[PDB]
C-alpha cells in the first residue's frame, strides 16, 4: 500500500498530462508527425483524430485518468 | 582424516571443553549449565549424562568421552560428572611434552602403575563401616543426595533404600560379591498420602499388571510359573494340519480341547488360584482356566514375568508337563490387591530364595512421586557400594592429596623415565581440590598450599578442603563421607579413558 504526498508529488501529476497532450498535439489538419501504432495483438492502427488512440491507452496515474475521461465525454 | 600431532592436541581440547563447567557441578555447590536451543528455549541441567547427550560433538575423540560416562552411569550413577575431568587432566599434564621426545606407550604403562598405587592407599586411609548398622551408612547417603539439590524428600528416601538393598543382598559366586540390585524395583502410585513410603517383600508389579480380576487376596495359594504352551495344538504338541475345511475344523477341535485340558490339570495340582502365563495363552485357553476355577492373569509382558518369577524367588519352566510344588511356585507366593485410587495395584510378597524387597512410593501426584524416586535412586546406589566393600572413605580432596604425595615419593624412588608421567598423574588428581576451592570463591594458591602442608604434618587422613566452608576441615567431623567402591570405580574408568584416548595417534575415516 503506497502513499505519496508533497509539492513535488503535485508536479508529477501535471508531468504525466503533458505526455498524453503530446500524443494528441496536432491532428487539426493533416500535418504533424505520426508513427504507426501497432498493438501487441498484431493489428496496425491509425485514426483521423488523435483522441481515438488516446482513449485506448491505459494510464497508471489516476490524476492522468481524469483527462482520459473528459476525452470520452 | 587426522594424523599425528593434530590428534594429541585434539584429545586434550575435546576433554577439556566438556570439563570446565561439569567439574564445577560436583559438590553441594553446583554451577548450572545453560543449553540454548535453536527454538530459543532453555534446558538447565546439573546432571552429566544430560549435558553430554544434548550437545553436538563433531570429533570422534569427543564421542569416546560421552560413551565412557555411559560406562560409569551403568555401574553406579554417581561420579558421572567426574570421570571426564580426571581423564582430561591426565592428558594435559603428561602428553604434549613427552611426545616431542616421543614415548607414548610409556605414559600409558605409568598410568596403570599409578592406578594400582592409588587402590592400595585407599585401604589404609579408609576405616571399616558396619554393613548392618543403619546409622553409620546413613550419613554417607546424606552426602550424596545433596549433589542433585533436593533435600526435603531425600530424608525419607535414604532409610527406605537401606532396607531395600539389604534385603535384595544374597548373591553368592564363591566369594560372595554383591552387585544384586536387579531384583529391586520401584512401584509407583500416583495419589494417596505423601508420607506412606515403605518396603514390602518380593517384587511388585504395575507396569502392565493392572487388571480388574486377580483374586482380591491370596494369603496361601501359589503362583505357577509358565512360559507354556497352554494354548492349543492342532496336532500333538506342534501343528501339522490346517483348518480350511468344515471336515478339518471338526476333527481338529477335539484335539484342541484335549491339549488345553491336560495342561490345566498339571497346573491345578499344586494348588494355585492365581496363575501367570507369559505367552502361549489363547481366548479359548483362558476360558479353560476359568472353567478350571483358576483366576488367569495373561497378556502381560515378558519383563513382568521375569519380575514375578523373582518375586516368589522360584524358577520358571517352559515345561508343559507335571508342574509340581517342587518345581514351580517354590515357597509361598502371596497376592494382595489394594485399590489406591480405583486402580488395581498388585503386590506379590514372600520370596524363598533368601529374601527380596521392593519399594512402595506413594505421591499425592505424579510430580510428588518423582522427587522421592530419583533421590531414592541415588540412595540405593550408596547402600549397595557400602555392602560391596565394607569401608567408607573420607570425602572431598583429602584422599586425592594422600595419593598426590605417594606418587611424589614413588616416582623419586624408582627414578625411571616413568618418573615424569607419575608426576603428571599426581597433578591430575589435584583438579578435585581446585574445584572445591573454586566452590567457596577463594584463591587457588592459598588453600592448595595449606593442604600440601597438612600432608607433611597429619598426612591428609581426613583433612581436606571442603567447598561449603572454604577452609581446611576434618571431613569425619562434618559428616562428609562416601563409600570406597564409588571412589575406586570412578578412578578406574578415568585411567581406562586416559589410556585408550592416548593410544589413538591417528584417526582415519
Amino acid at each position: 500500500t503506497d502513499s505519496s504526498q508533497g509539492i513535488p508529488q503535485l508536479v508529477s501529476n501535471i508531468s504525466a498530462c503533458q505526455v498524453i497532450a503530446e500524443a494528441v498535439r496536432t491532428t487539426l489538419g493533416p500535418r504533424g508527425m505520426d508513427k504507426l501504432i501497432v498493438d501487441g495483438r498484431g493489428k496496425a492502427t491509425i485514426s483521423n483524430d488523435g483522441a481515438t488512440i488516446l482513449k485506448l491507452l491505459d494510464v497508471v496515474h489516476p490524476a492522468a485518468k481524469t483527462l482520459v475521461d473528459i476525452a470520452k465525454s | 582424516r587426522e594424523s599425528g600431532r593434530k590428534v594429541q592436541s585434539g584429545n586434550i581440547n575435546a576433554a577439556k571443553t566438556i570439563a570446565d563447567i561439569i567439574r564445577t557441578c560436583l559438590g553441594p555447590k553446583s554451577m548450572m549449565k545453560m543449553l540454548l536451543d535453536p527454538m530459543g528455549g532453555i534446558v538447565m541441567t546439573n546432571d552429566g549424562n544430560a549435558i553430554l547427550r544434548e550437545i553436538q560433538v563433531q570429533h570422534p575423540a569427543a564421542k569416546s568421552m560421552i560413551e565412557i560416562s555411559r560406562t560409569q552411569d551403568e555401574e553406579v550413577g554417581d561420579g558421572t560428572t567426574s570421570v571426564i575431568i580426571l581423564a582430561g587432566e591426565m592428558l594435559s599434564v603428561a602428553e604434549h611434552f613427552l611426545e616431542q621426545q616421543m614415548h607414548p606407550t610409556v605414559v600409558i604403562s605409568a598410568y596403570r602403575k599409578a592406578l594400582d598405587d592409588m587402590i592400595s592407599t585407599l585401604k589404609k586411609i579408609s576405616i571399616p563401616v558396619d554393613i548392618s548398622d543403619s546409622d553409620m551408612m546413613l550419613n554417607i547417603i546424606n552426602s550424596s543426595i545433596t549433589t542433585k539439590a533436593i533435600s526435603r524428600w531425600s530424608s525419607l528416601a535414604c532409610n527406605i533404600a537401606l532396607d531395600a538393598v539389604k534385603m535384595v543382598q544374597f548373591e553368592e559366586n564363591g566369594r560372595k560379591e554383591i552387585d544384586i540390585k536387579k531384583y529391586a524395583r520401584v512401584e509407583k502410585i500416583p495419589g494417596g498420602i505423601i508420607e506412606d513410603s515403605c518396603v514390602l517383600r518380593g517384587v511388585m508389579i504395575n507396569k502392565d499388571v493392572t487388571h480388574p480380576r486377580m483374586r482380591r487376596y491370596i494369603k496361601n495359594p501359589r503362583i505357577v510359573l509358565l512360559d507354556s504352551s497352554l494354548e492349543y495344538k492342532k496336532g500333538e504338541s506342534q501343528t501339522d494340519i490346517e483348518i480350511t475345511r468344515e471336515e478339518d475344523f471338526t476333527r481338529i477341535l477335539q484335539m484342541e480341547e484335549e491339549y488345553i485340558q491336560q495342561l490345566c490339570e498339571d497346573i491345578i495340582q499344586l494348588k494355585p488360584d492365581v496363575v501367570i502365563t507369559e505367552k502361549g495363552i489363547s481366548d479359548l485357553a483362558q476360558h479353560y482356566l476359568m472353567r478350571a476355577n483358576i483366576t488367569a492373569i495373561r497378556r502381560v509382558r515378558k519383563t513382568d514375568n521375569n519380575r514375578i518369577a523373582r518375586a516368589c524367588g522360584a524358577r520358571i519352566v517352559s515345561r508343559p508337563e507335571e508342574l509340581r510344588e517342587d518345581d514351580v511356585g517354590t515357597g509361598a507366593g502371596l497376592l494382595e490387591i489394594k485399590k489406591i485410587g480405583d486402580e488395581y495395584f498388585t503386590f506379590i510378597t514372600d520370596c524363598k530364595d533368601p529374601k527380596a524387597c521392593t519399594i512402595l512410593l506413594r505421591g499425592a501426584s505424579k510430580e510428588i512421586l518423582s522427587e522421592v524416586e530419583r533421590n531414592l535412586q541415588d540412595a540405593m546406589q550408596v547402600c549397595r557400594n557400602v555392602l560391596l566393600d565394607p569401608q567408607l572413605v573420607p570425602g572431598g580432596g583429602a584422599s586425592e592429596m594422600a595419593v598426590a604425595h605417594a606418587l611424589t615419593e614413588k616416582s623419586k624412588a624408582m627414578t625411571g623415565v616413568e618418573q615424569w608421567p607419575y608426576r603428571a598423574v599426581a597433578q591430575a588428581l589435584e583438579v578435585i581440590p581446585r574445584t572445591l576451592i573454586q566452590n567457596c570463591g577463594a584463591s587457588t594458591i592459598r588453600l592448595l598450599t595449606s593442604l600440601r602442608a597438612k600432608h607433611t604434618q597429619e598426612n591428609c587422613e581426613t583433612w581436606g578442603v571442603n567447598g561449603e566452608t572454604g577452609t581446611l576441615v576434618d571431613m569425619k567431623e562434618l559428616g562428609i563421607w562416601e563409600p570406597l567402591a564409588v571412589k575406586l570405580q570412578t578412578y578406574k574408568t578415568a585411567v581406562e579413558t586416559a589410556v585408550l584416548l592416548l593410544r589413538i595417534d591417528d584417526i582415519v575415516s
Binding site: - | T17, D20, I21, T24, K29, S30, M31, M32, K33, M34, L35, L36, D37, P38, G40, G41, I42, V43, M44, E54, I55, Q56, Q438, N439, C440, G441, A442, G470
Partner: protein, 514 residues
Amino acid sequence: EVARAQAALAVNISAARGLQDVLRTNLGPKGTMKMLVSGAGDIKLTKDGNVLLHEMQIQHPTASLIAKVATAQDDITGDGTTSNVLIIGELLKQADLYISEGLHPRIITEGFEAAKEKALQFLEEVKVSREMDRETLIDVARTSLRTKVHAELADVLTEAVVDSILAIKKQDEPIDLFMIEIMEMKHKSETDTSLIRGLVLDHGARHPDMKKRVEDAYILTCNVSLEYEKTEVNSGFFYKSAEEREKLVKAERKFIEDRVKKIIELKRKVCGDSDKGFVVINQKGIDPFSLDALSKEGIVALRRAKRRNMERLTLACGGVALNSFDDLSPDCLGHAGLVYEYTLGEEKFTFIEKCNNPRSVTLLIKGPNKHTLTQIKDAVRDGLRAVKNAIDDGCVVPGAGAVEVAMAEALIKHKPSVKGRAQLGVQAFADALLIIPKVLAQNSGFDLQETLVKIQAEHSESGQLVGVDLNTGEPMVAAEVGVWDNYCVKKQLLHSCTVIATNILLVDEIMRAG
C-alpha cells in the same frame, strides 16, 4: 563454538540490562501502557509483565528464563511481575562491578543465601495486621487495578472486585477460584463496569419479550437440540438412497416434538400458575414455532447459549444439566430469585441474578469491543488475584517502594551472618531492591537521589513505612493514600529474584544444543 567464563556471564547481564528498560515503564500506575504488533502484527493492549513476555517473540535465553519464572508469580499475585525484571537487572549489575575488579561468582552466591534469609525475616517484623473489612479490601483492590489500567477506569473496576470477595466468604472459601467469570457487553463507552450477582447469558431468546421479567425462575439447563430443521441425514451423513435418510428424519423430528411437550407438562407440575415463571436455557436452537407456545404460558426459553454458561449455572443456581427434559420436581431444578433482560448495544444479554446457593458472580465489563475492552479484562483478572492474597495473608503493608527501602536499610548496616564471604553478596542484594521506589520518581520527573536520602531518613526517625506519592514522585506516607502491597507480592519478588539470578550467575559455559 562456545562462550566460556567471562563471555558466558557477559551475555546474561547485557540482556537483563535492555529488558529492564521496558518493564520499568509498566511499573506502578506511573508506568506506561504498551501494545504489541511485534508479537504477530494484530493489535493487543496489555499492561502486565508476564503477559507481555508471552506475546512477543523471545529467542534470547536470559529473556526466556525470566519469562518462565514469571509464569509462577503471575498465577499467585498477578502484581509484582512488572517489578520482577527490575530487581533481577540491578542485582546482576552490582555483581558485575566486583567481578571486573576481580571477584569469583561463587562468593557472590554465598552472600545471596545469607541475604535471602534476613530479607525474608524482615517481612515478618515489619508486616502490619489489617482487618478483613470492605474498606481494607478496597485498598488492595484499587492499588492493584491502578497498576494494570489508568486511575480513571481503575476506580470503576474497584467496586465490582470487592463485593465479589465479600460473597465468597459466605461460601467459606479462603481462596478464589470461582466468582471469576468475566463476561463482555456491547456498548459505546467503557467507563461503566456493572456487577451482576448471578450469571449472564451471551444470547437470549430469538423471539423478544416472552416474559423478560421472571419473578420465580426454575432453571432447567439442557443441551439437547429442539431444532434440527428439515435436513436429510441418516447418521449425520448422506446415504445412497433418498428414502433411507428420510425415515430417520421423521423419527428425529418426532423426538424433538415430545421434548417440547415436556416443557408444557413441566410448567404445570413445577409451576401450576403463571404467577411463577419457568426458565429454559438451551445451548442449542429452538424453533420459532415453539417460542410462541411457550411464551403465552409465561415461559422464557433461551437459545444458543454456551457450554461455559451451563457449568456456571449448575454451580451457582443449584441447577442440573440434563440430556433429557421430562417431568422433574423443583427439588432437582435450581432457583434464582430474579431474572431480568437488559438490551444494550447490538446484542441483548439475559441476566439470571440473585441466585440461591451462589458460588459464581459475574463481573460484567461494558466496552466498545476494541482492544480497550480486552485491556480492562486483563486488569480485572489480576485485580481478583490481588484481593485473593489479602484473604490468604493476614497482613498487608503500605507499598510504593516503602517496604523495599526499609529492607535495604536493614542489610547495609551489619553483616547478617558475620563473615566477609557473605558480605560481598550482601551489598549487591541491598542496592538491587532500591530500583522499585527510585524509578517511580524517575518516571514522574523527580531526581532519584533526593528521594532515597529523604525516604530512608524518615524511616529512621519514625518507624513508619513511608512510601512514594506516585504523581509528584516525592515521598509521602503510603498507608493513608491506599498504595498498599500484600504479603504475597513482596515475598514472590524476593523468591523469584534469588533463584533466577543464581542459575545465570553460575554459568561457566553456554554451548549450543539441537
